[PDB]
């Protein structure tokens, strides 16, 4: 079906104060985590974190465990390699992040693929959208780039992202149909709190919506008000749904001039909300 994604987010951290390193991976379909791996677990295995994924058999768990352990070992190595390239001390803790995955368009065909790396918070190396070449952030990443260009790592990635990634995503979308494939619209309200003598704060709330994308904007007489809008980060409820709010300070007595506009895939038509 429409916008869908399968993504894996991995994090390798060197720990010179503990003489070792740590690797963590999670997998997401859309906004829903379904598996994890942590090298600090005793008996570290790929683990289920959604009910629907547990009806995969042992060979799925075995294979995923083999492959994420393989990757953990190589990412252990990469951290050491990157220190060399950057000429860094052995005493600092460093972070290597890796995100890959696939995005299915509104027609359910593969629209984009990703495979990229960040070192100490900063973009390092990224598979281009053609899925035929790599972008490198600096001279260090040029070294990885040259190495991966000559080995044609892009082809192996292009095969994975167009084949197994999309097929897996489709099996997961089907296994988890009841939760992954229906959108829950937001429950909304508008609050009013006098916030100074001079001004009144209007807050437009959205609660209990999935998936997490949502548009909340304030309008007066057609013109948008995002200049002076405080918008919190969308945040998780803990039960699969999300919350957001947007607030605006308005002159007292002018409250009805202002409307909050809500767009979300769960809704039949966008809402126009007003303080009541």
């Amino acid at each position: 079906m429409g916008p869908h994604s399968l993504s894996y987010f991995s994090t390798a951290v060197s720990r010179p104060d503990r003489g070792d390193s740590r690797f963590i991976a999670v997998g997401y379909v859309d906004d829903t985590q379904f598996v994890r791996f942590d090298s600090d677990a005793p008996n570290p295995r790929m683990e289920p974190r959604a009910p629907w994924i547990q009806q995969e058999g042992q060979e799925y768990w075995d294979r995923n465990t083999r492959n994420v352990m393989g990757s953990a070992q190589i990412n252990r190595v990469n951290l050491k390699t990157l220190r060399g390239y950057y000429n860094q001390s052995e005493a600092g803790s460093h972070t290597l992040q890796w995100m890959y995955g696939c995005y299915l368009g509104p027609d359910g065909l593969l629209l984009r693929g990703y495979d990229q790396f960040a070192y100490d918070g900063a973009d390092y190396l990224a598979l281009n959208e053609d899925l035929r070449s790599w972008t490198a952030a600096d001279m260090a990443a040029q070294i990885s780039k040259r190495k991966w260009e000559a080995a044609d790592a892009a082809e192996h990635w292009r095969s994975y992202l167009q084949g197994t990634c999309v097929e897996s995503l489709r099996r997961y979308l089907q296994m988890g149909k009841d939760t992954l494939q229906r959108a829950e619209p937001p429950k909304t309200h508008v609050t009013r709190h006098p916030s100074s003598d001079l001004g009144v704060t209007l807050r437009c709330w959205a609660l209990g919506f999935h998936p997490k994308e949502i548009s909340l904007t304030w309008q007066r007489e057609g013109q948008d008000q995002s200049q002076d809008m405080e918008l919190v980060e969308t945040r998780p409820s803990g039960d699969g749904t999300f919350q957001k709010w947007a607030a605006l300070v308005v002159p007292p007595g002018e409250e009805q001039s202002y409307t909050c506009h809500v767009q979300h895939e769960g809704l039949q038509e966008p809402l126009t909300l007003r303080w009541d």
Partner: peptide, 9 residues
């Protein structure tokens, strides 16, 4: 389905 890195940086 987790991909095994064949390549190292």
């Amino acid at each position: 389905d987790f991909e095994r890195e064949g390549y190292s940086l």
